[PDB]
């Protein structure tokens, strides 16, 4: 017999400044929603629009594909939760895509021990950007950080790699195994999750 509780759009994220997704949750202490409707309008327009894609983003999600996403223009959005008994609206949320950018982790992290001849040996680390970022036209700019540690060390060593997709680390400990990860952020935005580790045995003859 209860109408749904008040829902809340609690997260939006853009992985690449070309699309974005928002996620909402129920407002417990109400009945079970049988439908949700997310609507929004844009700054400097009057037209009200509906979520264009309720599927792609999974449960309780609105995904905005490329044809619905633009930068430097606020989205004013709201979700309602309805059942047979009534309905409830979230607060309005003000979202600008420019400020919600967090990339996926970089890909293909690979590590190699390099021993030249009389001249410091080193660890060579290489990786690729996340897929679906447009670095080539300069639409998107990515910066990177590596971290590495042997098991049981209390602190990770962090190296800022700037915009390179490779890096060289000199002073490792001979005989030690290292866990290595990489993460990236836009020029202006949030760090990605760290990539899964790649593992590297640094040989005794270092």
């Amino acid at each position: 017999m209860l109408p749904p509780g008040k829902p809340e759009i609690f997260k939006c994220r853009s992985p690449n400044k070309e699309t974005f997704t928002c996620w909402w949750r129920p407002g417990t202490d109400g009945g079970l929603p049988t439908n949700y409707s997310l609507t929004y309008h844009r700054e400097g327009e009057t037209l009200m629009h509906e979520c264009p894609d309720y599927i792609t983003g999974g449960p309780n999600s609105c995904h905005f594909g490329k044809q619905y996403t633009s930068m430097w223009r606020t989205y004013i959005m709201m979700v309602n939760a309805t059942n047979q008994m009534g309905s409830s609206f979230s607060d309005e949320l003000y979202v600008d895509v420019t400020y919600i950018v967090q990339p996926d982790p970089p890909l293909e992290l690979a590590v190699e021990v390099k021993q030249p001849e009389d001249r410091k040996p080193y660890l060579w680390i290489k990786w690729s950007p996340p897929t679906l970022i447009d670095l080539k036209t300069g639409w998107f700019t990515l910066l990177y950080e590596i971290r590495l540690k042997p098991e049981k060390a209390a602190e990770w060593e962090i190296h800022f790699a700037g915009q390179q997709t490779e890096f060289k680390i000199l002073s490792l400990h001979p005989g030690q195994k290292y866990l290595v990860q990489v993460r990236c952020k836009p020029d202006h935005g949030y760090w990605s999750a760290w990539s899964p580790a790649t593992f590297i045995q640094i040989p005794s003859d270092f």
Partner: protein, 186 residues
């Protein structure tokens, strides 16, 4: 030496945008955090009448000559409000020291960036017409009102627009660098 010019221009535009974002956030925290000041920031920028690309495909459709000219117009349109921001803040009895220091730096670096951009234009397009047409900011009376809520909201709109236009300028310059120097193989 285009490559050196574009690098320095991009260092400045990234730096300016970052300072503008930090200034906005200090100001918001400190003066307007608990409010529908955001709800009032909607559609009120002096540059909004300029045709500015809003996604990658519009940027790609815009040719380079017009694109460089757009960036210069935006930067030239900000001379006036940045001068008044600094002047008014600096003229307070009790000037918020972190906010003022950033405003001063963006005022001074925005001038240097516009100098770099005019050098770039003279290299890449040596005969672009010498005609200014940039939009006029004329928001000084609202920055000067005694009514604190109106005053604060006018400052909030100014810094929200600054943070937006510095972001555009920075992004458009990164696109143009890639395009002009690297044929879109950055």
């Amino acid at each position: 030496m285009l490559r050196d010019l574009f690098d320095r221009a991009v260092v400045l535009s990234h730096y300016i945008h970052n300072l503008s974002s930090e200034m906005f956030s200090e100001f918001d925290k400190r003066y307007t955090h608990g409010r529908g000041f955001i709800t009032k920031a909607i559609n009120s920028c002096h540059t909004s009448s300029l045709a500015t690309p809003e996604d990658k495909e519009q940027a790609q459709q815009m040719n380079q000559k017009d694109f460089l000219s757009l960036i210069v117009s935006i930067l030239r349109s900000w001379n006036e409000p940045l001068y008044h921001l600094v002047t008014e803040v600096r003229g307070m009895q009790e000037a918020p020291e972190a906010i003022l220091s950033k405003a001063v730096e963006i005022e001074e670096q925005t001038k240097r960036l516009l100098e770099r951009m005019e050098l770039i234009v003279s290299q890449v397009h040596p005969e672009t017409k010498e005609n200014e047409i940039y939009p006029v900011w004329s928001g000084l009376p609202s920055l000067q009102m005694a009514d604190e809520e109106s005053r604060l909201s006018a400052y909030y709109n100014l810094l929200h627009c600054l943070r937006r236009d510095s972001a555009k300028i920075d992004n458009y310059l990164k696109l143009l660098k890639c395009r002009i120097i690297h044929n879109n193989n950055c």
